Design an enzyme around this catalytic site. Sequence first.
Site, mmCIF file in Angstrom:
data_model
loop_
_atom_site.group_PDB
_atom_site.id
_atom_site.type_symbol
_atom_site.label_atom_id
_atom_site.label_comp_id
_atom_site.label_asym_id
_atom_site.label_seq_id
_atom_site.Cartn_x
_atom_site.Cartn_y
_atom_site.Cartn_z
ATOM 1 N N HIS A 34 0.819 -1.208 0.000
ATOM 2 C CA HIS A 34 0.000 0.000 0.000
ATOM 3 C C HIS A 34 0.854 1.261 0.000
ATOM 4 C CE1 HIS A 34 -3.368 -2.527 2.141
ATOM 5 N NE2 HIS A 34 -2.873 -3.120 1.071
ATOM 6 N N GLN A 58 -18.269 -6.459 -2.464
ATOM 7 C CA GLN A 58 -17.245 -7.121 -3.265
ATOM 8 C C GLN A 58 -16.645 -8.349 -2.585
ATOM 9 O OE1 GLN A 58 -15.004 -3.454 -2.772
ATOM 10 N NE2 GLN A 58 -13.083 -4.577 -3.054
ATOM 11 N N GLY A 138 -2.653 -0.601 -7.876
ATOM 12 C CA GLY A 138 -1.482 -1.439 -8.074
ATOM 13 C C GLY A 138 -1.663 -2.380 -9.252
ATOM 14 N N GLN A 144 -8.659 -5.805 -11.743
ATOM 15 C CA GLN A 144 -9.230 -4.654 -11.058
ATOM 16 C C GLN A 144 -8.790 -3.351 -11.729
ATOM 17 O OE1 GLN A 144 -7.790 -3.087 -6.807
ATOM 18 N NE2 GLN A 144 -9.606 -4.386 -6.570
HETATM 19 N N1 LIG Z 1 2.577 -6.081 -4.515
HETATM 20 C C1 LIG Z 1 1.835 -4.976 -4.636
HETATM 21 N N2 LIG Z 1 2.392 -3.886 -5.215
HETATM 22 C C2 LIG Z 1 1.656 -2.779 -5.342
HETATM 23 N N3 LIG Z 1 0.392 -2.565 -4.965
HETATM 24 C C3 LIG Z 1 -0.134 -3.659 -4.393
HETATM 25 C C4 LIG Z 1 0.500 -4.873 -4.196
HETATM 26 N N4 LIG Z 1 -0.352 -5.776 -3.572
HETATM 27 C C5 LIG Z 1 -1.462 -5.097 -3.412
HETATM 28 N N5 LIG Z 1 -1.406 -3.812 -3.887
HETATM 29 C C6 LIG Z 1 -2.478 -2.811 -3.844
HETATM 30 O O1 LIG Z 1 -3.522 -3.294 -3.024
HETATM 31 C C7 LIG Z 1 -4.739 -2.665 -3.458
HETATM 32 C C8 LIG Z 1 -5.926 -3.448 -2.961
HETATM 33 O O2 LIG Z 1 -6.128 -3.153 -1.572
HETATM 34 P P1 LIG Z 1 -6.068 -4.309 -0.500
HETATM 35 O O3 LIG Z 1 -7.013 -5.460 -0.861
HETATM 36 O O4 LIG Z 1 -6.355 -3.656 0.805
HETATM 37 O O5 LIG Z 1 -4.562 -4.884 -0.579
HETATM 38 P P2 LIG Z 1 -4.219 -6.310 -1.139
HETATM 39 O O6 LIG Z 1 -2.886 -6.764 -0.628
HETATM 40 O O7 LIG Z 1 -4.151 -6.277 -2.693
HETATM 41 N N6 LIG Z 1 -5.423 -7.377 -0.659
HETATM 42 P P3 LIG Z 1 -5.093 -8.955 -1.179
HETATM 43 O O8 LIG Z 1 -3.821 -8.975 -1.969
HETATM 44 O O9 LIG Z 1 -6.286 -9.463 -2.088
HETATM 45 O O10 LIG Z 1 -4.960 -9.902 0.076
HETATM 46 C C9 LIG Z 1 -4.614 -2.599 -4.976
HETATM 47 O O11 LIG Z 1 -5.289 -1.457 -5.493
HETATM 48 C C10 LIG Z 1 -3.102 -2.466 -5.204
HETATM 49 O O12 LIG Z 1 -2.839 -1.110 -5.532
#
Ligand SMILES: Nc1ncnc2c1ncn2[C@@H]1O[C@H](COP(=O)(O)OP(=O)(O)NP(=O)(O)O)[C@@H](O)[C@H]1O
Lengths: 270, 270
Positions: A34, A58, A138, A144
């Site tokens: 994040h 969602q 991301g 997404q």
């Molecule tokens: N390795 C990564 N690099 C950059 N952004 C990331 C990465 N992993 C997750 N994100 C960001 O996480 C956002 C989603 O929010 P959130 O679900 O709170 O995190 P998450 O780690 O992706 N959840 P999840 O991976 O499904 O257990 C996306 O919009 C991405 O921008």
Amino acid sequence: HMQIIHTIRELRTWRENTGKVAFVPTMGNLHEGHLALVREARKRADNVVVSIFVNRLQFGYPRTLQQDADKLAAEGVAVVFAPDEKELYPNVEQRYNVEPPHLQNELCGKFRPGHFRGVATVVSKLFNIVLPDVACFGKKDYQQLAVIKGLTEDLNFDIEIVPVDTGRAADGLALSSRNRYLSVGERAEAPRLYRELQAVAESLKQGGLDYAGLERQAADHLTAAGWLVDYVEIRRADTLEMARAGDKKLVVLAAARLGTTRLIDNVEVG
Amino acid sequence: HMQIIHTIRELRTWRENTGKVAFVPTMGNLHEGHLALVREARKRADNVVVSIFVNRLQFGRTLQQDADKLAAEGVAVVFAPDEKELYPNVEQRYNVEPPHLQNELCGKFRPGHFRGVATVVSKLFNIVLPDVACFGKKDYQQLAVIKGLTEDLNFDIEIVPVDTGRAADGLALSSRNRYLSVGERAEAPRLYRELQAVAESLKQGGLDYAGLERQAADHLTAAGWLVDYVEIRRADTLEMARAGDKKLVVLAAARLGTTRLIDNVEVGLP
Ligand SMILES: Nc1ncnc2c1ncn2[C@@H]1O[C@H](COP(=O)(O)OP(=O)(O)NP(=O)(O)O)[C@@H](O)[C@H]1O
Ligand SMILES: Nc1ncnc2c1ncn2[C@@H]1O[C@H](COP(=O)(O)OP(=O)(O)NP(=O)(O)O)[C@@H](O)[C@H]1O
């Protein structure tokens, strides 16, 4: 310095008179992945809004609100917008939804029905609440990202959508909260996902034309090593349109499970 | 004084320096009923935008003549983009999807229309960024669809309903009226007359709603009309009416020959 705002009215009051706003929507439980979003955001606007909201629309989940705001205060975030459910969904049902095209039923959507509709809808609501100039998402959640780029174009949201690079571990594993579910042995096996995607990417860079054969080989290597493969697919970059013979801007995407835990990753090729 | 603007980019540039904006979206062919909307808008902001736009996603006089009627009314901008400006790929992948209301009443006879209306209004809202938007009560279902999406998607826009402008004989003004034959135009005021008679029965404590709907439809059928529907519904929300209700609306749609006409009467019981 940093403000915590819980109502739409207070958020709008703060955002007026403010100039450029960069916006990062999250579901909380913030981690290094994040912060990449936040750091890129702060490079694009003096005023960074981070939303923390978990969306009933969602899901198919921890809170830790106090720890989240502390991680963001250090990163120069101006406002943390954290409304409760009733604030965004004052009635039970959401009657008007942003309906994605058939992409919502492909790839991850095949096993998460309604998920991308819920993402498109809550992001449209958040866009209309924050009125940002720039919004960071991301590249790890590529589908997404395509849905959000698509709704932005088709609904004429005047918002610059900024893809942010996937943070990875030293062994190549894409950073994600999902990694915490992996046993010790599974975590040592988890980097094979990225390795197979890269091997597909090299074959494409080396003139490989058999898309379906490349997907199968990657799937076969994962299955033989103990994974349960959801999909491996070559598609057009950015839009996730079907890949056509001769396409030069492509992306390889995969989702596969180690035990109960589903991991996703992707590699762009030019 | 008044400007004709055809591109989203020029609309955004003009709107940026302007303060409060009141917005009247139309399909052109303007008549006095539209001017009622414009006058209400002009009471609420120094800067009134009137859009003129049509497309095969919601159909389910020249521009100069339209612009001349508006210059006289204190309109700042006539926004007239072509189809490609708003729908650059023709297909609309992301649509604002209404609830089941979109298939009731007129939507029963116009598949896809209220989805297309909801979608194009959201797009225009995101283009014009108005503070106030005016819509006519003659299109009562449309008004409820627009209020619903405004709330559900958190558009920070005040929705101002405007009463139906009528001809001297009661006929609700509409672009469709010019297609009516000589005999058909003389018969057309019977639609509003029966709706008023239904409203009169309700004001006198009538509870046989279903019987009232049938009698009006049968009388219009007997008079040569092809009736799509006559329905008593709850005001504002268009929820189905229940026997004790005090805030009601009677709605009708019926055809004289080739031209489909709609109208309604609101009733407020003590
Ligand atoms: N390795 C990564 N690099 C950059 N952004 C990331 C990465 N992993 C997750 N994100 C960001 O996480 C956002 C989603 O929010 P959130 O679900 O709170 O995190 P998450 O780690 O992706 N959840 P999840 O991976 O499904 O257990 C996306 O919009 C991405 O921008
Ligand atoms: N007689 C009327 N009185 C008040 N508002 C009206 C009237 N007719 C139309 N409007 C409103 O004007 C706006 C534009 O409607 P529009 O469809 O462009 O006009 P129209 O007369 O319905 N054309 P059509 O339905 O194709 O015959 C909407 O908000 C309508 O509700």
